[PDB]
Structures are given as structure tokens and as C-alpha cells.
Amino acid sequence: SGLGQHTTTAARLYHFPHGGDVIDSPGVREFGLWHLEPEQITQGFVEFHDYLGLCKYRDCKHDTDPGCAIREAVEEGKIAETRFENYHRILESMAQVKTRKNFS
Amino acid sequence: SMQDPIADMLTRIRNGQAANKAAVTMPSSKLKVAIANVLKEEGFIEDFKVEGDTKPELELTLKYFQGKAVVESIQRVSRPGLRIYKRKDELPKVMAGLGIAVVSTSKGVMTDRAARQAGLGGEIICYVA
Amino acid sequence: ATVNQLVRKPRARK
Amino acid sequence: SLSTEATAKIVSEFGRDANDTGSTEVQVALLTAQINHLQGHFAEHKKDHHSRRGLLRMVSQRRKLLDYLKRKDVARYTQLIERLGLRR
RNA sequence: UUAGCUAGUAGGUGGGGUAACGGCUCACCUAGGCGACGAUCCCUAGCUGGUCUGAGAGGAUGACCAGCCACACUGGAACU
RNA sequence: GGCGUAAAGCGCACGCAGGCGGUUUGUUAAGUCAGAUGUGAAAUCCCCGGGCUCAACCUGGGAACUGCAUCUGAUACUGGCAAGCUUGAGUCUCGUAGAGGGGGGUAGAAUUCCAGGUGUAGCGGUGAAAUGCGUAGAGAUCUGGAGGAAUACCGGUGGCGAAGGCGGCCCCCUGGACGAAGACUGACGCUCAGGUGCGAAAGCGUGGGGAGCAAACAGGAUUAGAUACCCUGGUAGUCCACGCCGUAAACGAUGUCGACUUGGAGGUUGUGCCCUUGAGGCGUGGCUUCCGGAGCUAACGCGUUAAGUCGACCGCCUGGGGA
Ligand SMILES: Nc1nc2c(ncn2[C@@H]2O[C@H](COP(=O)(O)OP(=O)(O)NP(=O)(O)O)[C@@H](O)[C@H]2O)c(=O)[nH]1
Ligand SMILES: [Mg+2]
Ligand SMILES: [Mg+2]
Ligand SMILES: [Mg+2]
Ligand SMILES: [Mg+2]
Ligand SMILES: [Mg+2]
Ligand SMILES: [Mg+2]
Ligand SMILES: [Mg+2]
Ligand SMILES: [Mg+2]
Ligand SMILES: [Mg+2]
Ligand SMILES: [Mg+2]
Ligand SMILES: [Mg+2]
Ligand SMILES: [Mg+2]
Ligand SMILES: [Mg+2]
Ligand SMILES: [Mg+2]
Ligand SMILES: [Mg+2]
Ligand SMILES: [Mg+2]
Ligand SMILES: [Mg+2]
Ligand SMILES: [Mg+2]
Ligand SMILES: [Mg+2]
Ligand SMILES: [Mg+2]
Ligand SMILES: [Mg+2]
Ligand SMILES: [Mg+2]
Ligand SMILES: [Zn+2]
């Protein structure tokens, strides 16, 4: 009615007419962020590399901290606010996934 | 209901013997007298009395050792649902000859030990163990 | 358990 | 079942005296008039299945009482079946 | 997870028939007969004395021995 | 051998056939029992032997073959017949309690809708918001009217009904249960395969009815997605008549009936007697819960309402999955 169905299975291999291979993917709605620290979440975005080390403090949550230069870049308009509000949704998701425990 | 009154008779004996009752009463009949009179002659009970003619009431005096059950267990064998009959040589013994088996024949109610000199067979009533 | 029940149908051997 | 005038009359109708009230032929007449009393009730009240249990009890009770007189003395049996309108 | 089956079918008369009784057969007459104590239908199987197992009661089975029935490529028929 | 929870008691009731049956006497000798005759081929097995140098094997006699038929006996029990008897099961009267069922009226709150009045910026909703609603005056309050369904308190392991179930009040029709005093019939009884009827709710057919609640569905949040949760609405349905469907964790997870076996705390409902010397004292039946001895059970627990000891009959289970 308003959703999508995952009929095709995990991965089937083929070949290009020129060269290389294809790998199909499942219909996946999962997000496993149990890998590393939230310092690696700062490295997971391209344009936020060039704006690190510009804020007030040497450690910063960038949400409730005064003088965030990354937040000043969003307020200027060089970074869209859709990406910034979704960025702290990633950080607040780690306050909700981490709850019980999981380790490899 | 009361379709097997001999089984009702054995029910009232086994309860009062185990529950340290001194004496019991029960509705009398011709067949219940002919069984209790044998048990009086075989040292299992003490005395029996009859009361009433329009309502025949049989009474039994119990028997103890030092407050222990003389009649340890008794087993109804034949029943209205399944009749049991044996011959003069197929009469079973109770506790390899210790207990007696009440068998009613045409010469009256007697034991299997008394039926050897009588040489008859018939209906097994109860295993007096 | 009843003998009169087994008159109608005996014990079913597997 | 009925009133006192309807109960005591039918006992005097079929009984030898006023004390002849426990016999089987009196007990058939108590059930025969009661089923005849409930003919117009259950026609209008077909959804009353709880009173129908009391009705079918008296039908089964009267059938067992007719079988006792029939197996003992058929002379009094053939009198009562036509005097009350039975055997259909 | 087979409930109705059956018209020579059930019975009677007479004729015929076989070594013997008999719907065994024929004409007629009657409408019964069978059956929830398994009729009928389907599937399987020679049966028994026995053997084997089991304390016994039971259970499984029917080779060799013996008794009986049936069969002799398939089906049908009669003679002697 | 089991069926409260390991697999299993039909959801319940009526009832034919079948099975079973109080007590006293007579008769029959059917069943059973006693004895006898005939028979149960031989072989096999068993008992004592013999023989092949032994054993296996062969073989003499006996036992056994628990079978069937007939005759002569006995009559305690069972069956049949006959006459009964009353404690079983029934009948009458006087009563009492109850949401037992069916039918027909009626009441007042509350909900929503509508009419009118006063009155103003939010109402509504949630963890927080939003959809939605409201300046055409919502919401709130008051007056009046309509419709629908359910009956607060009473009300409680309280009552009734075979069970599912059943609750405002009143009338009409009607069912059973129980108690007291006697009278009366005389086993008229128990049980149940098929058969028969009842049977929560959902759903189905026809025609009505329509507040509130509420599958599907509409909308807003939630979320990775929300299909669900949460919220605002809302059809079928819930209501009635007329049928059909007959399934539930239809459970006390205990089929019905009867007989006995130490007992308490109570509840409900009667009845009998008693300085009525208080709605009390003493008994005594019907219904019902919590404890608990003996006993039973695998434990849990049951334990005078048994799952204790017994009888009468019926249903059902045979490793799990497939199913
Ligand atoms: N109109 C239109 N339909 C398209 C287009 N591409 C794909 N579709 C349709 O979208 C549907 C989904 O395609 P599909 O490739 O099966 O999706 P998927 O992502 O592989 N599904 P899954 O998760 O099961 O593997 C199909 O019905 C396909 O025809 C397009 O460009 N236009
Ligand atoms: Mg009444
Ligand atoms: Mg002829
Ligand atoms: Mg063959
Ligand atoms: Mg041969
Ligand atoms: Mg077992
Ligand atoms: Mg189970
Ligand atoms: Mg039940
Ligand atoms: Mg021989
Ligand atoms: Mg010999
Ligand atoms: Mg020999
Ligand atoms: Mg030798
Ligand atoms: Mg007799
Ligand atoms: Mg109202
Ligand atoms: Mg009399
Ligand atoms: Mg429909
Ligand atoms: Mg919802
Ligand atoms: Mg409808
Ligand atoms: Mg079921
Ligand atoms: Mg319980
Ligand atoms: Mg104890
Ligand atoms: Mg207890
Ligand atoms: Mg299986
Ligand atoms: Zn910062």
C-alpha cells in the first residue's frame, strides 16, 4: 500500500559486458553502529573533515556546547541543516542502541 | 448404587478396622449373615448381632492385636460386572494358604480349606487376607 | 479399564 | 403444577380413596394434565428452552411410568391409555 | 473413510430331478428374507493337529510329518 | 496400565437398544458346581523305561490334550417365574429462598445529537506534540427535546441454572432445587454407543435499528521503515426479529451415580426444642469456601464436596513431529 517488499535474496553474481562484476543487495533496513567510538562518526562525513579543530574546546558534543564552529558553518549556510539535524540523530541513536549491551 | 452390597460390606469393614473404630453397623441381609458367621468362626471378627425386622441392621464387633489391624486387607474377587467361578481343584489360596477364600457352594458358605473335604466348587466371594 | 468396554472393542494392537 | 382444586380432584377421580395418591396411575394423570396445560405456552414461547427442559423431563418421566404398568398388568394399562387419550 | 442387502431371493403347493433330503429345477401362490450379536462390499489368507516364543495367561506362524479341502496352461461342458 | 497439571473425561443434558441391580419366601435347575459315560486320530511335548558303543535320534506304556456332547445329582449365589416387603427411587400437602427462562411495560443518571440563553480564545489530546475542532461563538454552564444501549451503590470464593451462562424496578406465563409433618405406590432403578436438543463470542442469510465503542480504512505523531503501539475520526459489527453456523483455556484443565472413613474456621439456607428471660442457648438437614490428620499421589497438592478405600456403567489415550 505504501511500503516496499524485499523479494530478491542476498547476492547473485554476474559480469559486465566490459569488465567487473555486480553484487545485488537485500532489502535492508538495519543500522549497525557497534563498530567504533563516536570520534569515528566525525570522520564519517566529507565536508566535516575541513571544519574540525575550529571550535572553542578541544572536545565538543557540538549540540549543547557554546561556540561550536561546525554549528556556525550550518548557520552560515555552507552546510545544509538537514545534514546537521540528522547528524545529532545519529548521536542520539547511539544513546538508544547501546542500552542493553553488544560486543563481537 | 448399592448393586454390590457385599462390596459395600467389605468397604465398611476395611474402614473401621483401619480407623480404630470399636464397632460398626450396616443393613443386614441373608447373604451378609452367611459371610460374617464364617469370619467369626475363623478368628477374624468377634461377634455379630441383628437388630430390626422391617429394617434389618447387622452389627460387627471389630478385633485388634495391640491396636493393630487384624484384617490387614480384603479383596472382592467376583463382582456383578464379571462373575468368577472355579472348580473343586481350581480353588485359589490366599497368601499361599495363610489367608482363606470365602466360597459359597450348595452346601453353604465355607472356606477353600473346608471345601477340600466337601469336594465342590462355585463362586469366590472375597480373599480374606 | 472396564471389562464390559472391551466386549465391544478389544485392545488395539499396534 | 396446578392449583389445589385441580390436584385433589384428579386424585379422587382415578384413586380408590383420598389416600390413593402415590400410585402409578395417579402419577401419570398428574403429568398428562400438565403437558396438556403447557400446549399453548410453548407455542408462543418457543425461545424458552429452559422451561422446555422441565417439559421434556415430565415427558420422559411419564414414559417410564407407562412402561411399569405395561410390564406388570396390561388390564389397567389399556384402561388408562384411552381414558387420557394416549398411544397416538 | 462399507449400512442397508436380496426376485429363484424367503416360504408354500404340485410337477421334474439326483444314490439320498432340499429353489436342486420349473409353473403358480405369498412378501417376505438377511442385518449393528457386522448383513453386504473391499482387501488379504489354504486350514488344523502343531511348531517357536513366554513363569503362566497370551503372542507370532502353518516348511519337513500327519488329517482334510481346493487346484493340474486359461475357461466351459459332458461321457465312461 | 492410565486420563487435576506428563498423551488422554466428549461443552452439557435427555434417552432407546446393551450392561447392571435393594430386601423376604417359594419354584425352575438356565448359568455355575459334583459324578459318570462317549469323544478329544496318530505323531509332537511331559513321566518312567528300552535300544542304536554314546548323544542326537528311534520307540513301549502312562500322563496330558485344561475341549465338546449327554445323563444323574446338589440349590448357597446369579438368571427365569410367583407372591411380597420398604431403607432405594417416586407422589400429595404446608412452606421458604433465588440475577432460572420467555413475553410486555416503565424509571432515572450518563453519553451523543438538536433547539434556546448567558458567555470568550482556546478547547481537545499526549511522555512531549500534532492531526482534528472553535470568533458562523467552540469548549464550559443552564433550560427544553429526541434517539440508542447498559443497569452505579446494593454486591459479597454471595445466590440460581445441566452447562455456556444469568443483575434497574413492576406485572403476566412457566421451570427446577430444598426443608418440616405424615399419608401413599412398591425396585417403578442406575447408566449410556448411535439418535435427540441446548450451547460464550466472532462470522453468514433476510429485513429493520444506530448513541457510544470499534476490524478494514482515513489522518497525525512515533520510527530505519509504523503496517502495530499512541492520538483524532470512522464502516462492517455490537441492538431487534427471523434462520443458519455448533466451534473456545466451553476449566473445578477432575464423566455420571451410590456407600463408608478424625476433624476445625466460616458463609448461605431452613427446621426442632428452650429461665421467648436480646437479633440469643441447644441440636439438626440443603448449598459453599479456606485450612488440615490418617491415607493416597511423581511432586504440586487432594484430603467427608477426594485426587482415600470400593462398586455400577460410559467416553478417551499409546513417543515427539508429520497431524
Ligand atoms: N515506473 C517505473 N517503475 C520502475 C522503474 N524501475 C523499476 N520499476 C519497478 O519497480 C518495481 C521494483 O523493482 P525491483 O527491481 O524488483 O526492486 P528491488 O529493489 O529489486 N526489490 P528487492 O528489494 O526485492 O530486491 C518493479 O515492479 C519495477 O518494474 C522505473 O524507472 N520506472
Ligand atoms: Mg414452584
Ligand atoms: Mg417341491
Ligand atoms: Mg494367495
Ligand atoms: Mg500333505
Ligand atoms: Mg504407564
Ligand atoms: Mg497434557
Ligand atoms: Mg465439562
Ligand atoms: Mg495322538
Ligand atoms: Mg501314543
Ligand atoms: Mg513320543
Ligand atoms: Mg546311554
Ligand atoms: Mg432370586
Ligand atoms: Mg443522558
Ligand atoms: Mg402396601
Ligand atoms: Mg456477510
Ligand atoms: Mg489505533
Ligand atoms: Mg448482521
Ligand atoms: Mg475443542
Ligand atoms: Mg484451579
Ligand atoms: Mg499430615
Ligand atoms: Mg486440604
Ligand atoms: Mg502418532
Ligand atoms: Zn563544536
PDB file of N, CA, C and O (backbone and C1' of nucleotides) and ligand atoms in Angstrom, chain F residues 84-86 184-186, ligand 15:
ATOM      1  P     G F  84     -49.283 -59.943  45.939  1.00  0.00           P
ATOM      2  O5'   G F  84     -48.585 -59.070  47.074  1.00  0.00           O
ATOM      3  C5'   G F  84     -47.216 -58.700  46.977  1.00  0.00           C
ATOM      4  C4'   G F  84     -46.436 -59.159  48.182  1.00  0.00           C
ATOM      5  C3'   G F  84     -45.820 -58.061  49.033  1.00  0.00           C
ATOM      6  O3'   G F  84     -46.749 -57.495  49.939  1.00  0.00           O
ATOM      7  C1'   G F  84     -44.222 -59.770  48.642  1.00  0.00           C
ATOM      8  P     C F  85     -46.800 -55.905  50.166  1.00  0.00           P
ATOM      9  O5'   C F  85     -45.504 -55.599  51.038  1.00  0.00           O
ATOM     10  C5'   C F  85     -45.324 -56.194  52.314  1.00  0.00           C
ATOM     11  C4'   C F  85     -43.909 -56.022  52.801  1.00  0.00           C
ATOM     12  C3'   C F  85     -43.374 -54.599  52.764  1.00  0.00           C
ATOM     13  O3'   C F  85     -43.794 -53.827  53.874  1.00  0.00           O
ATOM     14  C1'   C F  85     -41.770 -56.075  51.839  1.00  0.00           C
ATOM     15  P     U F  86     -44.267 -52.307  53.662  1.00  0.00           P
ATOM     16  O5'   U F  86     -42.911 -51.476  53.741  1.00  0.00           O
ATOM     17  C5'   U F  86     -42.005 -51.665  54.823  1.00  0.00           C
ATOM     18  C4'   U F  86     -40.609 -51.193  54.488  1.00  0.00           C
ATOM     19  C3'   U F  86     -40.438 -49.683  54.317  1.00  0.00           C
ATOM     20  O3'   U F  86     -39.161 -49.298  54.822  1.00  0.00           O
ATOM     21  C1'   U F  86     -39.753 -50.785  52.345  1.00  0.00           C
ATOM     22  P     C F 184     -50.751 -45.181  54.411  1.00  0.00           P
ATOM     23  O5'   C F 184     -50.527 -45.138  52.834  1.00  0.00           O
ATOM     24  C5'   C F 184     -51.616 -44.914  51.951  1.00  0.00           C
ATOM     25  C4'   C F 184     -51.142 -44.548  50.568  1.00  0.00           C
ATOM     26  C3'   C F 184     -50.244 -45.562  49.880  1.00  0.00           C
ATOM     27  O3'   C F 184     -50.966 -46.636  49.302  1.00  0.00           O
ATOM     28  C1'   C F 184     -49.335 -43.389  49.625  1.00  0.00           C
ATOM     29  P     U F 185     -50.306 -48.098  49.216  1.00  0.00           P
ATOM     30  O5'   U F 185     -49.567 -48.103  47.805  1.00  0.00           O
ATOM     31  C5'   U F 185     -50.295 -47.899  46.603  1.00  0.00           C
ATOM     32  C4'   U F 185     -49.372 -47.732  45.423  1.00  0.00           C
ATOM     33  C3'   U F 185     -48.346 -48.836  45.224  1.00  0.00           C
ATOM     34  O3'   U F 185     -48.880 -49.967  44.558  1.00  0.00           O
ATOM     35  C1'   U F 185     -47.291 -46.724  45.027  1.00  0.00           C
ATOM     36  P     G F 186     -48.696 -51.437  45.181  1.00  0.00           P
ATOM     37  O5'   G F 186     -47.142 -51.743  45.012  1.00  0.00           O
ATOM     38  C5'   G F 186     -46.527 -51.744  43.726  1.00  0.00           C
ATOM     39  C4'   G F 186     -45.053 -51.421  43.811  1.00  0.00           C
ATOM     40  C3'   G F 186     -44.145 -52.591  44.183  1.00  0.00           C
ATOM     41  O3'   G F 186     -42.880 -52.424  43.544  1.00  0.00           O
ATOM     42  C1'   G F 186     -43.944 -50.895  45.810  1.00  0.00           C
TER      43        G F 186
HETATM   44 MG    MG G  15     -48.615 -51.586  50.741  1.00  0.00          MG
END
